[PDB]
Recover the amino acids of this structure.
């Protein structure tokens, strides 16, 4: 599908996530796309917890949704 | 007074800093002192001998390495075009000939030591050494520097640009 | 050659560049053996240990010399004298 | 899992904490003490070794002999203030001749 | 006879030297002298900090006391550089 | 460019100086002197503009209008007056039941000023008709609440003194969003204040758990009524535990600056990486009052104890700027010489981001 | 405050008497300034260590016992204050 990853500065990024693609692979694709390490990112959907070692289908997030990529620190 | 034309029109000046105030161990490893502890002992002010000069607010005694002179080092073929451009732009004889084969031009690139003067009663003499295989000119003093005087070295020209310094021994010429 | 005082400067500079020890091994070792025998008998020394002491000595000793040097300069002369050594030893605060 | 990489330093931190714990300097220590000590030792070692390398490349020799360390420690002034009463094995002494003892003639 | 295992600050300072000047070799004698120097400064600072902690009726050794010790012991602007570097290291360590 | 690396002296036209703030890009300094007067100094020009005899009791805060024609002052004697920038007299005068903490002007609505009364809900006073509109709050109405606009002032954010943050509209007052701060591990925490920026809609929050946190003004209306706290970086000082008094945002939108109380430790970080980059070396003995960078150029200027200390980037152009064809550099390579040796009748007439905080119209050359 | 005065607070007879307790007679008139200088450079370190010690203890007054503690840190010990 396609979802939005909203950052802190205010830029909006649109990415494609498959129904059967784990979150770790999505983070790896993001890291190879724009260089932000997975340790510097985590998913938040409308102020709700999302982890890295899981899959989108386990959370059942609707399409065209925005995810609060609340910034992190290296390591 | 906007109705009488005063004289001394042509100037041909480049370093527009002329003011009326002028309110002033082994060999190889001494390179550090050239670039770090060599920017306070000398100020730039209006010379009394001729034009601009390097006045002093500090003191340096005999046998003390002070400054390395660097500039656009070129061969002797460029001397012809360089002198033609000196005549055109109104450029002084900055043909600093370290030897007859290489000359240190100082009209397109040069260091702060472009501000020096000449007189038959100078304060320092020239010297050159070789560090790391490269020949570099560093000056060692023979006396102490007082506060408020200008560096000047004898050009050692064997006996028309006059040398107007006012000294009694001043030969009034580069000779 | 001639002109005494010229060769001294050359020797002192040559040795200032160098960084070797200055005391023959065997005489100093035997002296340390004797001064140890003064305290206790039949002490086996480590060859590394002796060397150790050796270096420290020169360090101490050379410092003393330098001090005496400037003391002679304070007395309007070049040659150093025994009296200057007692001067340095007393003024250092180690008598 | 390691602990030195948590701050990005190079000197070990677990070793420092163990050695300070068995060093009976006190009975109970905090968490920032070992990392802080590792950091300050890092800074001092870097400060000394940079001058060591500069002196090594002075004489164009790859290996750093202790003479280079002696020169680098002595020529600096803050080190001489901090390394006051300390010598160096095989260190030697920096060249020095008194000013008034310099003969000359015409 | 029976081989023994000894600890020296050999690998870490070597890594530091490579990180700074990855073109210059080091000698074993220099290795030992650097080991002695680091042991010396470590013991000096630790002992001074400990006796200060005893002086204040405190049974603990915090991180603050060590920076007080390095303010006292280290002279000049080197003290400021070292204390700033230590604060940087601890701040970068905690949130990890 | 990068963070300021040089140090500047003081700027004391008069001995006392309590508060300071830049207008839009650091034009004039609004000094609220501790004598009941309002002094205006000149920034980037090192001068003074106007002295206003406001009242007897001194003031404690200052801000200017969106159109730059007013000088609002959170008085210590409840004088909510609209002093004129031009003439210096009072245009509008009003009294509030509670004093004011943070005065601001919406860059799109100068009619409704920003007021932060204590033990009462924030009140917007309309300058067109002198009418007070109370901001609807939740739960208690006697808490130490601070109210502040967003980047554009289109939404207003309020912080209470139990752990609750409220989101509503600057003009419609439709309170439809709340937020509960994290309760540590066992004990809850109140909020001291929040502080915004001019780009990115980020905002720092200062709480009573000794830790400064950061949020963004976009995750509360997106989550809805109330969600789970999730800051980016829980920055703090873990070697001295200095409390936090006043801290503002960067002049570029990527840095974060935090101020001490008496320790002279001015900390800085960047939003991308929460790693310390530099620390300020301040001379101990004074209490910091206000900090606010140049909203465009990296520089730091902190007021304290009647004086001001500036750490800056002092710059003078190089001597080699005489002409583009004239340079004064040094090289040891041989000179690389050159290798390549209309008519119209038209007269000449032609002569962070930007917001609306302009038109001070205050300058007296004589 | 920083004032050039009170530096000459040790007027000439005090140094005279101190020299007498030292056991000297002929002192040149240009000794006083360098005596002031050496006294100031000495006092700098002790007062600095004392203020650091009192600051670390979270109080803004200085006692005598911390002063002798700093003095012992340098190496010169005092007896008679605890
Ligand atoms: N006193 C003097 N009178 C006339 N020419 C001088 C001079 N001293 C040096 N020169 C010439 O000027 C050339 C350097 S340019 C002079 C330095 C610089 N422009 C200044 O204002 O001082 C040299 O080649 C030298 O020959
Ligand atoms: Zn002359």
């Amino acid at each position: 599908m396609q979802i939005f990853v909203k950052t802190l500065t205010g830029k909006t990024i649109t990415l494609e996530v498959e129904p059967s693609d784990t979150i770790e692979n999505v983070k790896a694709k993001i890291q190879d796309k724009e260089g932000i390490p997975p340790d510097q990112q985590r998913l938040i959907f409308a102020g709700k917890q999302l982890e890295d070692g899981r899959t989108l289908s386990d959370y059942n997030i609707q399409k065209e949704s925005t995810l609060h990529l609340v910034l992190r620190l290296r390591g | 007074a906007r109705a009488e034309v005063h004289l001394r029109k042509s100037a041909f000046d480049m370093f527009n800093f002329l003011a009326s105030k002028h309110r002033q161990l082994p060999m190889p490893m001494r390179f550090r002192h050239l670039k770090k502890t060599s920017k306070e002992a000398v100020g730039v002010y209006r010379s009394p001998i001729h034009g601009r000069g390097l006045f002093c607010k500090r003191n340096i005694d005999a046998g003390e390495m002070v400054i390395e002179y660097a500039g656009n080092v070129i061969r002797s073929i460029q001397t012809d075009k360089r002198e033609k451009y000196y005549d055109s732009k109104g450029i002084g004889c900055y043909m600093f000939r370290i030897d007859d084969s290489e000359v240190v031009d100082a009209t397109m690139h040069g260091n702060a030591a472009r501000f020096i003067n000449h007189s038959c009663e100078p304060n320092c003499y020239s010297r050159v050494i070789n560090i790391d295989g490269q020949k570099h000119i560093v000056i060692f003093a023979m006396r102490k520097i007082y506060r408020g005087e200008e560096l000047t070295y004898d050009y050692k020209f064997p006996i028309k640009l006059p040398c107007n310094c006012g000294a009694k021994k001043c030969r009034k010429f580069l000779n | 050659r001639y002109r005494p005082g010229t060769v001294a400067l050359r020797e002192i500079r040559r040795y200032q560049k160098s960084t070797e020890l200055l005391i023959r091994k065997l005489p100093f070792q035997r002296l340390v053996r004797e001064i140890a025998q003064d305290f206790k008998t039949d002490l086996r020394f480590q060859s590394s240990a002796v060397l150790a002491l050796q270096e420290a000595s020169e360090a101490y000793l050379v410092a003393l010399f330098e001090d005496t040097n400037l003391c002679a300069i304070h007395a309007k002369r070049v040659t150093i004298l025994p009296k200057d050594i007692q001067l340095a030893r007393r003024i250092r605060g180690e008598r | 899992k390691t602990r030195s990489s948590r701050a990005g330093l190079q000197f070990p931190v677990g070793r420092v904490h163990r050695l300070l714990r068995k060093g009976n300097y006190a009975e109970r220590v905090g968490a920032g003490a070992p990392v802080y000590l590792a950091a300050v030792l890092e800074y001092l070692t870097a400060e000394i070794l940079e001058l060591a390398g500069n002196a090594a490349r002075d004489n164009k020799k790859t290996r750093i002999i202790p003479r280079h360390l002696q020169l680098a420690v002595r020529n600096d002034e803050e080190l001489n203030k901090l390394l006051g009463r300390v010598t160096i094995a095989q260190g030697g002494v920096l060249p020095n001749i008194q000013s008034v003892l310099l003969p000359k003639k015409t | 006879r029976r081989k023994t295992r000894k600890e020296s600050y050999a690998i870490y300072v070597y890594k530091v030297l490579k990180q700074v000047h990855p073109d210059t070799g080091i000698s074993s004698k220099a290795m030992s002298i650097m080991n002695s120097f680091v042991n010396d400064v470590f013991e000096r600072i630790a002992g001074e900090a400990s006796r200060l902690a005893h002086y204040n009726k405190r049974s603990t050794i915090t991180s603050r006391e060590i920076q007080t010790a390095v303010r006292l012991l280290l002279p000049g602007e080197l003290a400021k550089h070292a204390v700033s570097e230590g604060t940087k290291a601890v701040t970068c360590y905690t949130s990890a | 460019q990068n963070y300021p690396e040089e140090a500047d002296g003081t700027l004391d036209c008069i001995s006392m100086a309590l508060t300071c703030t830049f207008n839009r890009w650091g034009t004039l300094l609004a000094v609220g002197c501790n004598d009941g007067r309002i002094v205006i100094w000149d920034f980037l020009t090192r001068g003074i503009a106007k002295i206003i005899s406001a009242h007897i009791h001194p003031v404690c805060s200052l801000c200017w209008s969106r159109d730059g024609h007013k000088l609002v002052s959170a008085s210590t004697d409840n004088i909510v007056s609209q002093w004129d920038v031009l003439s210096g007299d009072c245009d509008q005068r009003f009294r509030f039941p509670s004093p004011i903490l943070k005065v601001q002007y919406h860059p799109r609505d100068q009619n409704k000023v920003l007021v932060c009364p204590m033990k009462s809900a924030p009140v917007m006073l309309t300058l067109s008709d002198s009418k007070h509109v109370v901001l609807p709050v939740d739960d208690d109405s006697d808490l130490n609440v601070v109210a502040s606009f967003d980047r554009r002032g289109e939404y207003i954010y309020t912080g209470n003194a139990k752990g609750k943050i409220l989101v509503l509209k600057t003009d419609s007052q439709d309170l439809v969003a709340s937020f509960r701060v994290t309760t540590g591990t066992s004990n809850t925490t109140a909020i001291k204040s929040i502080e915004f920026a001019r780009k990115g809609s980020c905002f720092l929050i200062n709480t009573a758990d000794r830790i400064i946190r950061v949020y963004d003004g976009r995750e509360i209306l997106t989550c809805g009524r109330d969600g789970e706290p999730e800051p980016m970086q829980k920055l703090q000082d873990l070697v001295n535990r200095t409390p936090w008094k006043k801290c503002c945002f960067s002049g570029d939108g990527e840095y974060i600056v935090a101020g001490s109380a008496r320790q002279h430790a001015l900390y800085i970080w960047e939003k991308s990486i929460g790693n310390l980059v530099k620390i300020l070396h301040g001379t101990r003995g004074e209490l910091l009052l206000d900090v606010a960078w140049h909203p465009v150029r990296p520089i730091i200027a902190s007021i304290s104890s009647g004086v001001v200390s500036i750490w800056a980037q002092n710059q003078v152009e190089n001597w080699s700027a005489f002409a583009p064809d004239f340079k004064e550099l040094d090289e040891n390579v041989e000179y690389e010489e050159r290798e390549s040796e209309e008519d119209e009748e038209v007269d000449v007439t032609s002569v962070d981001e930007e917001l609306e905080d302009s038109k001070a119209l205050l300058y007296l050359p004589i | 405050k920083v004032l050039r005065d009170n530096i000459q607070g040790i007027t000439k007879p005090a140094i005279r008497r101190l020299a007498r307790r030292g056991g000297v007679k002929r002192i040149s008139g240009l000794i006083y300034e360098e005596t002031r200088g050496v006294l100031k450079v000495f006092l700098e370190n002790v007062i600095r260590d004392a203020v650091t010690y009192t600051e670390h203890a979270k109080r803004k007054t200085v006692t005598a016992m911390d002063v002798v503690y700093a003095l012992k840190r340098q190496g010169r010990t005092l007896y008679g204050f605890g």
